[PDB]
UniProtKB/TrEMBL annotation, chain A:
GO terms for biological process: clathrin-dependent endocytosis of virus by host cell; fusion of virus membrane with host endosome membrane; fusion of virus membrane with host plasma membrane; positive regulation of plasma membrane raft polarization; positive regulation of receptor clustering; symbiont-mediated perturbation of host defense response; viral protein processing; virion attachment to host cell. Residues 3-97, 106-442 form the Human immunodeficiency virus 1 envelope glycoprotein Gp120 domain. One of its GO terms (molecular function) is identical protein binding. This is Envelope glycoprotein gp160. The lineage of its organism: Viruses, Riboviria, Pararnavirae, Artverviricota, Revtraviricetes. HIV-1 lineages are divided in three main groups, M (for Major), O (for Outlier), and N (for New, or Non-M, Non-O). The vast majority of strains found worldwide belong to the group M. Group O seems to be endemic to and largely confined to Cameroon and neighboring countries in West Central Africa, where these viruses represent a small minority of HIV-1 strains. The group N is represented by a limited number of isolates from Cameroonian persons. The group M is further subdivided in 9 clades or subtypes (A to D, F to H, J and K). Inhibitors targeting HIV-1 viral envelope proteins are used as antiretroviral drugs. Attachment of virions to the cell surface via non-specific interactions and CD4 binding can be blocked by inhibitors that include cyanovirin-N, cyclotriazadisulfonamide analogs, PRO 2000, TNX 355 and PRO 542. In addition, BMS 806 can block CD4-induced conformational changes. Env interactions with the coreceptor molecules can be targeted by CCR5 antagonists including SCH-D, maraviroc (UK 427857) and aplaviroc (GW 873140), and the CXCR4 antagonist AMD 070. One of its GO terms (cellular component) is host cell plasma membrane. Its main location: host cell. The CD4-binding region is targeted by the antibody b12. The 17 amino acids long immunosuppressive region is present in many retroviral envelope proteins. Synthetic peptides derived from this relatively conserved sequence inhibit immune function in vitro and in vivo. It is found in: Host cell membrane; Host endosome membrane; Virion membrane.
Amino acid sequence: ENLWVTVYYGVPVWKDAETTLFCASDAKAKHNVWATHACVPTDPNPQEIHLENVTEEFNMWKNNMVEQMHEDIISLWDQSLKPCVKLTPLCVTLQCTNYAPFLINELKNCSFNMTTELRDKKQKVYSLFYRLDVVQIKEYRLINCNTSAITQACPKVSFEPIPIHYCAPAGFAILKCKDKKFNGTGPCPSVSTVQCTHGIKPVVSTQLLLNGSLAEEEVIIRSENITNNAKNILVQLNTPVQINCTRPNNNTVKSIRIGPGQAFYYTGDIIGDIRMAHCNVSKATWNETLGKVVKQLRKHFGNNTIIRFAQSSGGDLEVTTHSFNCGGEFFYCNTSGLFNSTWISSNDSITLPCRIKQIINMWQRIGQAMYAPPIQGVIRCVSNITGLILTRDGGSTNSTTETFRPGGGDMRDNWRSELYKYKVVKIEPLGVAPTRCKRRVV
Amino acid sequence: NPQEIHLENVTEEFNMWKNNMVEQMHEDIISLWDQSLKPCVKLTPLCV
Amino acid sequence: VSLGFLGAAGSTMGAASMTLTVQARNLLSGIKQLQARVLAVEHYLRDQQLLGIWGCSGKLICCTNVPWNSSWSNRNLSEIWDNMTWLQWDKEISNYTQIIYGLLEESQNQQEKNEQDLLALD
Amino acid sequence: VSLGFLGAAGSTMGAASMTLTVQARNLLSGIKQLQARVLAVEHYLRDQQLLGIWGCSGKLICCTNVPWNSSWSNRNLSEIWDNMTWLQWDKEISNYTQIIYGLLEESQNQQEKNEQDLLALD
Amino acid sequence: VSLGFLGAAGSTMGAASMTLTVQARNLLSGIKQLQARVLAVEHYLRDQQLLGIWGCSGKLICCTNVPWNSSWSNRNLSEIWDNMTWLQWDKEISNYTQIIYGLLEESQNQQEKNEQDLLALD
Ligand SMILES: *[C@@H]1O[C@H](CO)[C@@H](O[C@@H]2O[C@H](CO)[C@@H](O[C@@H]3O[C@H](CO[C@H]4O[C@H](CO)[C@@H](O)[C@H](O)[C@@H]4O)[C@@H](O)[C@H](O[C@H]4O[C@H](CO)[C@@H](O)[C@H](O)[C@@H]4O[C@H]4O[C@H](CO)[C@@H](O)[C@H](O)[C@@H]4O[C@H]4O[C@H](CO)[C@@H](O)[C@H](O)[C@@H]4O)[C@@H]3O)[C@H](O)[C@H]2NC(C)=O)[C@H](O)[C@H]1NC(C)=O
Ligand SMILES: *[C@@H]1O[C@H](CO)[C@@H](O[C@@H]2O[C@H](CO)[C@@H](O[C@@H]3O[C@H](CO)[C@@H](O)[C@H](O[C@H]4O[C@H](CO)[C@@H](O)[C@H](O)[C@@H]4O[C@H]4O[C@H](CO)[C@@H](O)[C@H](O)[C@@H]4O)[C@@H]3O)[C@H](O)[C@H]2NC(C)=O)[C@H](O)[C@H]1NC(C)=O
Ligand SMILES: *[C@@H]1O[C@H](CO)[C@@H](O[C@@H]2O[C@H](CO)[C@@H](O[C@@H]3O[C@H](CO)[C@@H](O)[C@H](O[C@H]4O[C@H](CO)[C@@H](O)[C@H](O)[C@@H]4O)[C@@H]3O)[C@H](O)[C@H]2NC(C)=O)[C@H](O)[C@H]1NC(C)=O
Ligand SMILES: *[C@@H]1O[C@H](CO)[C@@H](O[C@@H]2O[C@H](CO)[C@@H](O[C@@H]3O[C@H](CO)[C@@H](O)[C@H](O[C@H]4O[C@H](CO)[C@@H](O)[C@H](O)[C@@H]4O)[C@@H]3O)[C@H](O)[C@H]2NC(C)=O)[C@H](O)[C@H]1NC(C)=O
Ligand SMILES: *[C@@H]1O[C@H](CO)[C@@H](O[C@@H]2O[C@H](CO)[C@@H](O)[C@H](O)[C@H]2NC(C)=O)[C@H](O)[C@H]1NC(C)=O
Ligand SMILES: *[C@@H]1O[C@H](CO)[C@@H](O[C@@H]2O[C@H](CO)[C@@H](O)[C@H](O)[C@H]2NC(C)=O)[C@H](O)[C@H]1NC(C)=O
Ligand SMILES: *[C@@H]1O[C@H](CO)[C@@H](O[C@@H]2O[C@H](CO)[C@@H](O)[C@H](O)[C@H]2NC(C)=O)[C@H](O)[C@H]1NC(C)=O
Ligand SMILES: *[C@@H]1O[C@H](CO)[C@@H](O[C@@H]2O[C@H](CO)[C@@H](O)[C@H](O)[C@H]2NC(C)=O)[C@H](O)[C@H]1NC(C)=O
Ligand SMILES: *[C@@H]1O[C@H](CO)[C@@H](O)[C@H](O)[C@H]1NC(C)=O
Ligand SMILES: *[C@@H]1O[C@H](CO)[C@@H](O)[C@H](O)[C@H]1NC(C)=O
Ligand SMILES: *[C@@H]1O[C@H](CO)[C@@H](O)[C@H](O)[C@H]1NC(C)=O
Ligand SMILES: *[C@@H]1O[C@H](CO)[C@@H](O)[C@H](O)[C@H]1NC(C)=O
Ligand SMILES: *[C@@H]1O[C@H](CO)[C@@H](O)[C@H](O)[C@H]1NC(C)=O
Ligand SMILES: *[C@@H]1O[C@H](CO)[C@@H](O)[C@H](O)[C@H]1NC(C)=O
Ligand SMILES: *[C@@H]1O[C@H](CO)[C@@H](O)[C@H](O)[C@H]1NC(C)=O
Ligand SMILES: *[C@@H]1O[C@H](CO)[C@@H](O)[C@H](O)[C@H]1NC(C)=O
Ligand SMILES: *[C@@H]1O[C@H](CO)[C@@H](O)[C@H](O)[C@H]1NC(C)=O
Ligand SMILES: *[C@@H]1O[C@H](CO)[C@@H](O)[C@H](O)[C@H]1NC(C)=O
């Protein structure tokens, strides 16, 4: 009946905390932007420890791991651009003609002067540009030269995203929600703890999410304010749809030296046919997937309400299109074929047009732009569509109609798609509790 | 004053060829060279 | 049973108190990494600092001379140790941890050592 | 005699065990330097961490409750302490140090404290 | 009275010795900051290192086996503890602190543990 406080060191106690995480990935054989020269190798085996009886609240939208990853991708991009060749002298006036035998189709053959390696001497060379990179005043100029400076991506580096593990330091920990039907924030009954997350591929993408992790059981709808239209809508598929993306054009590259050491790689004349880049999607599987999504969608809008799908109708060219990277080239796909539907109460694979741009400012970056060097040979990448990003048209009249447009307003949403399950906490191992014990009297 | 302490009876295997102090020093001289070049005058216009 | 790091986070405080070594092991073991490693040893040394001023440096558990003021919690032994988790306990005793820590260094260690000097003075 | 830091690395384990303070002193005392200093305090705190979970924080030597399993080494007192160096000993006991450390925190300290709670419970 | 961090810097050594916890609390708690934080934990761990080799890790005060050589200071108990401040004392004992620290690890701890092995050897 006489109680005295007792110190316990190493008690299972944690608090919500934001700390600086770090990278981790298994060692491979080069030089990709994300791995850099060095990122700590992963443990051969991670120890994922289930925590019985433990219920913790998760919030994917107020999560700081997202903001950290966002700034990390941006900063990594700039760290990779510094040593490469900056194309400040490439803002010379371009004398351009259309290709010339265009039956039904844009890309333009241009000629221009260029500084050689000697300052004083000049060369007249020619290059082929996809007409998104140039604008007129036949005289032309690069799109970027009035907005920002430009630098050329080094040829060696690869833009092929590899799994990255985010780790928290000792004394902190990561909680992982394993609740299958987890609707995007809330209490997670089944929670396990790890020091590092699983391999998250930093896939740079717009509208549809590519090569990601699939939700088990039902497809999952994650938002921040479901009745609100301004906030985007995250979709995680249970079945991945397969999408085959190719640039058929036989691109040949030449190397012109523009200064001491500096060497620009330019798109030579195409050899063979002129075909436009495209992406195929099995209409059957995409119709099943679209069906299953609207089944889970109607759980939030009453039950036989009219759910239609329309195209993107807002914003710049770089945001309205499914932008991504494939083999080196940057694809801007028009996704009108998929989102042209209405829902109430042979192979036939859909085909999607894709244009190509070599000058790019991703993540709303105004400032130092990048020139994607031309890629030799025909390109073909097979990818998974594991998620989606949707947006409403506005306050709908509520049980009257529901029209959906795909968006990609912000790039963090892509990190939220794979970091929805993880949360960072700090261990407070000091607990004091009363027992009927006293220390030896002085 | 450094304290060089003799270790009686102690026999250790050395390998000068698999030594990492060499690789460290190598990268240090290279990196130091570049750190010293940055602030100085770059003669890009001298290729006339 | 050994359930692992934080294995008994959701068990009763009495059951969890048996596996303090489990949480104790992993509790200690370029720029981002380095700053993180410094933060880790900094937090660890803070807790070891508090155990120091409470005279409990080498032990995981130690008993004190501070009596339990009933205003802190009105529960008993059985209700605390066989019905609650350390998490919800730390939440209930989140208004006093500063206060209890201050009494913990002062009431005993700030008077255990003075009496120690006056006692070993012969 | 004081032979200095690591002076008895090549002496018998018994002779070397007398000068543990010698190795203990120097064991703790821009970017390259800073990263090196952090690594140093990190390793030192790791060993002090292991001494902590073995209940031996303030001492250089402490005795244990773990019996010596003869599978580890078949030598005796005289053969270990008057014929071998700590180096070749650590090489012979390099398959068990992990195992012995696990038994060292669990067999005694993970049961010394439970019995301590059940004993000081009156 | 609690006067605060360094409150009794200008009081007598005896009065100041009562509030060692006060100086002990705040004694532990981008590039410039990080280098400063490392320097702080480095100095703190140095002093804790010295307390370690003197067998006084968990205590603020501990008594020793080293006798007071009168060549160090010719003062007495009353003159030291009731007439001087720790500052002017540390200035008077600034020629021996190295010497006294060496005797402090060797005279006792370097012989307390050897005798401990020869005593617990049965
Ligand atoms: C979703 O996930 C899927 C699954 O991972 C992704 O699909 C994969 O995408 C990969 C990258 O997008 C793609 O990888 C490429 O495959 C090409 C063909 O592979 C064939 O050869 C390899 C052996 O090398 C075989 O194992 C394989 O079976 C095939 O037969 C490779 O050629 C590609 O490597 C080249 O490109 C990368 C950049 O991506 C460079 O880093 C690399 O060095 C290669 O580039 C050299 O070779 C080309 C050849 O034309 C040259 O043009 C170029 O200039 C380079 O040449 C220089 O360097 C070499 C070497 O140093 C030197 O000798 C030479 O002289 C030059 O200096 C690349 O590996 C996968 O094939 C594809 N998976 C499948 C199953 O198809 C999908 O992308 C993901 N989704 C998204 C959105 O990312
Ligand atoms: C650097 O250069 C690049 C390329 O050279 C610039 O990118 C172009 O920027 C211009 C203008 O900044 C932009 O032209 C406008 O595009 C809009 C969207 O497509 C059009 O809606 C707009 O049309 C209106 O303005 C015209 C006059 O310029 C009118 O003739 C026309 O009728 C439109 O006016 C109607 O609408 C307005 C607004 O509602 C209303 O007030 C009027 O009363 C009227 O009803 C322009 O055509 C190009 O689209 C950009 N080019 C590309 C390829 O994207 C870049 O902006 C420059 N950098 C900087 C920093 O300025
Ligand atoms: C895109 O534009 C670029 C411009 O830099 C263009 O490159 C040039 O195309 C012209 C096409 O006329 C090439 O000129 C030809 O060169 C060949 C070989 O030297 C000549 O034999 C040709 O002469 C014949 O055609 C004339 C037409 O009037 C006749 O008068 C004459 O009698 C001959 O029958 C002609 O002069 C020129 O060589 C290239 N330049 C380079 C550097 O290669 C490119 O071809 C355009 N893209 C496409 C798809 O056409
Ligand atoms: C995109 O366009 C380019 C054109 O710039 C094209 O490159 C050409 O591809 C073919 C291969 O399909 C190359 O032909 C080979 O070249 C090598 C090296 O010179 C030769 O050794 C080869 O000889 C073999 O084949 C002969 C057939 O008669 C045999 O007689 C001989 O014994 C050998 O077995 C062969 O000629 C050609 O050199 C390149 N051209 C250039 C300029 O690089 C490329 O194929 C197109 N891309 C794609 C993906 O198709
Ligand atoms: C996911 O679904 C859960 C239902 O289990 C939502 O949680 C409720 O949200 C409403 C507001 O929409 C709150 O008033 C309730 O307090 C919540 N209920 C419980 C039991 O926590 C959650 O909001 C949904 N998430 C999203 C993004 O819509
Ligand atoms: C794209 O989706 C396919 C399934 O449609 C994935 O193929 C499966 O990959 C898993 C590994 O995660 C294997 O266990 C399965 O056996 C594969 N399926 C079949 C039918 O063989 C493929 O990995 C996905 N691609 C990604 C995520 O890049
Ligand atoms: C994307 O490409 C893959 C492989 O190139 C296609 O898979 C082929 O599908 C047909 C049946 O439709 C099979 O006969 C082939 O055996 C498959 N190929 C392989 C290598 O297994 C897939 O159908 C393509 N997707 C689309 C939408 O066209
Ligand atoms: C993507 O493709 C669609 C075709 O479905 C294009 O939509 C047309 O846009 C024009 C105005 O630009 C309208 O007058 C037509 O009625 C639309 N077509 C249909 C069938 O409705 C769309 O412009 C393309 N998007 C981009 C960015 O090129
Ligand atoms: C190259 O420079 C000359 C001036 O010496 C100019 O006449 C010519 O038009 C330039 N080349 C092109 C393709 O415009
Ligand atoms: C979010 O939804 C609630 C639900 O009624 C609404 O009251 C609130 O205004 C919405 N917030 C925003 C920012 O639109
Ligand atoms: C909507 O349909 C689902 C599935 O059949 C059913 O569980 C639910 O009760 C329906 N909602 C209403 C309001 O009728
Ligand atoms: C796509 O939209 C257009 C415009 O209304 C329409 O003519 C076409 O039938 C739609 N395609 C499909 C597959 O519904
Ligand atoms: C216990 O808490 C009460 C708050 O009502 C306070 O007045 C009292 O001084 C405390 N008692 C002790 C012994 O600290
Ligand atoms: C902590 O203090 C606040 C305000 O003084 C009070 O609302 C809260 O209930 C207190 N916590 C507990 C566990 O009593
Ligand atoms: C000693 O080692 C043997 C290996 O043969 C093992 O089977 C046994 O359990 C160990 N004994 C103890 C008491 O740990
Ligand atoms: C350690 O284990 C390996 C393989 O199990 C064995 O070859 C080696 O002899 C062992 N070490 C000792 C000292 O027995
Ligand atoms: C005390 O100091 C004197 C200096 O005159 C020295 O000779 C003597 O050895 C010291 N005594 C002890 C016991 O250390
Ligand atoms: C310390 O030594 C120097 C020179 O040996 C001497 O001048 C000084 O007085 C000494 N300090 C004390 C307190 O005696």
